[PDB]
Amino acid sequence: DIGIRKRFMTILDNSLERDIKERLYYVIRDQNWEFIADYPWLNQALQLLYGSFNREKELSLKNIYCLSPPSILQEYLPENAEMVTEVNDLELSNFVKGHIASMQGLCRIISSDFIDSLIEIFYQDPKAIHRAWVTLFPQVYKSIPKNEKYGFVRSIITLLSKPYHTRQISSRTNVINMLLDSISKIESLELPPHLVKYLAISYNAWYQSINILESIQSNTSIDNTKIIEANEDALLELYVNLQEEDMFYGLWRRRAKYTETNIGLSYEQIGLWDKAQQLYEVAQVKARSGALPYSQSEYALWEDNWIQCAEKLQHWDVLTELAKHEGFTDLLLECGWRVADWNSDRDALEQSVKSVMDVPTPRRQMFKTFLALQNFAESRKGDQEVRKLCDEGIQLSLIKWVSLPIRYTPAHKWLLHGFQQYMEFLEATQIYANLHTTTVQNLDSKAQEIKRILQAWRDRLPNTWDDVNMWNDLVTWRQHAFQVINNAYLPLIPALQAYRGYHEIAWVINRFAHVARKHNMPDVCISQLARIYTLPNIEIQEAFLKLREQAKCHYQNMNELTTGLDVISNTNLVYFGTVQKAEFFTLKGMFLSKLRAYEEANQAFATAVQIDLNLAKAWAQWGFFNDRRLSEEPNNISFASNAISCYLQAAGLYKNSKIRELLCRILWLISIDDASGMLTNAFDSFRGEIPVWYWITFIPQLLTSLSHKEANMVRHILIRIAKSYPQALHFQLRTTKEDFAVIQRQPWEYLQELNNILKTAYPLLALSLESLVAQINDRFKSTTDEDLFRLINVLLIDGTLN
């Protein structure tokens, strides 16, 4: 209400003194803003500081180089000018002087109107307060003299450390952001105690604090070696809270003192956790019996990063007794601990949860919700408090989402994984509720809902480059949810007289054992293919991915290829399929061609390829084998025809994949200068549909192949391109056609044939494209001054170069 508000603010303005130092000390030290603590009070603070101004009629900008004045611009008429002498009988002469007298009074701007018109913008928008404070406060800090900066910065810490700021925690535009941003524009007081900046993260202030903490790294603030290391501690903890791990590893191995710490951090950033774990053990050993003090911050790094590498490597039996040796919720993070029950020690987990489920985190809340879900599972007619614990977990995760920055950080990915975990909890509630009413043996009536939710779960899995802890967490809690239905279908097995006991746990083992092999973790990829023997039958898809992943395990570390050779060469019984034996035989071909073997690997590829003629991986590996035999000789031997035939077969039915390297091999092996026409036979006897769309990306290498000899099999590819994909070839065709036309026989003959095929089929397209290209070529030609400019530039760079 504008009248009473204006009266309150003007008596508060008239109470103070008209000095800037006294009003700055009033808004920082003296005034208690605890009552206005939900409202941005810097508004009121600005209205005090703007009270110390003077009302100066000479307000004028000095940064803009403004619009053209009539003073000197009517002196830009150098010598040919008949200056008129006092013609003053017009309507123009009074209009000009009236306009001069009008613009004199219009452009006399005092400071008063700017100040008090900006004041009422603050009451509508709180972002003029932010910008006004950040512009004003680094300028009025200059009034604070030396031998008084210590008391001023201590009053700043006292103002920022006030407890009433929690009435602005749930806001994006806190006074703490508006104040830390003005701290960051000073570079004199821009060092505050800097574990306050890391704890002013109860508010948002993430980059307002990272600016402050990184402007001490690049400051000559070397008064202590314990201010710098505490600055680095707070900066690394802000990087951990934002999950920016590359800056974390860079700052750590810029600040570390041991060398084994540097080696372990580098192996940990790359993702090799076995060698990083060994290097952290070596760095821990050399500090017990060494001559270095290890700074009490590298020691915690060695301990915790050892635990993280051991978590990634899935050594849960070590970490279980490590968490039994000391009181810690590492013990809670063995939710998957080679476990099939989670019920015989239910109380031992409930007490561990309840002792730590104060100051709750989303993870411990997820553990409490899973305990309630298992209580509903193992004891039917349960609670349906799972529908309440999931909702309080969703609300906790939403508070944690608003506490993070607005734009997506890597820390938001774990909140997205937590959202998926709560939705899978609610779907598991539906699964268990359907599982409790099938006690009357109502199979194939309520099993369809279970199959639908399991099919929804099979397509809902994280990205393959996501963390292996994310994959492992989803895999372990899906194994819990599958163990419940396998336990509840266990009484109903013999009363049926394949069967409805699923045990599709193997799926979420195999899909895990695949993805760890993508993450270059072969030891756990072998170790995960040992929990598949819980049922002794050979299934149509368990044995498929099991044997395929076990054979793909022994492909690198070349002292291990015999261990992949002896496991496939003795297995001849078919594991429900005639396509598995073909990939077995071509994997025998890979393992035999990896060692030095000339004819037997060719025989293995032949018996791999005769059985089906439908596995393109066998054709591709036979082409690679023929190229490896070619690489010990010149490429003109007719043995290359076998290579290009297996390559062309390896691109016809390997479609919608990475086939362009096979096309590169075709274009390079075709270009040999053989006199015998065996390679042209090997290209031109190919029975299959060539991947016309993937030949587009080599259209220049096709179009310069017409100029090269021994290449008219390129013409079939270009003709099949021009009749199906005409807009890919057109610009390249016109460019190389007008290239060859001005230098003047098969090149221009083939180019005119391709242009004729592109012009008869799709004539409207060629007409419109040629008219567009011609209009751009005629109308976008540069003028005279631009040509003179580029000529003088090339002359000047050549003159200064010579």
Partner: protein, 43 residues
């Protein structure tokens, strides 16, 4: 003075559980490496 001002909140915390217990009770050495070595010896 100044060095004692710039380190006001610099108090180390061993773990989340200890922080939880320290904030809960107010309102109501190389032992790890030795443990890993002795557990590798026991196997």
């Amino acid at each position: 003075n100044y060095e004692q001002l710039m380190l006001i909140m610099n108090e180390r915390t061993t773990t989340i559980t200890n922080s939880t217990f320290a904030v809960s009770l107010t309102k109501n050495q190389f032992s790890r490496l030795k443990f890993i070595e002795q557990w590798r010896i026991n196997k």
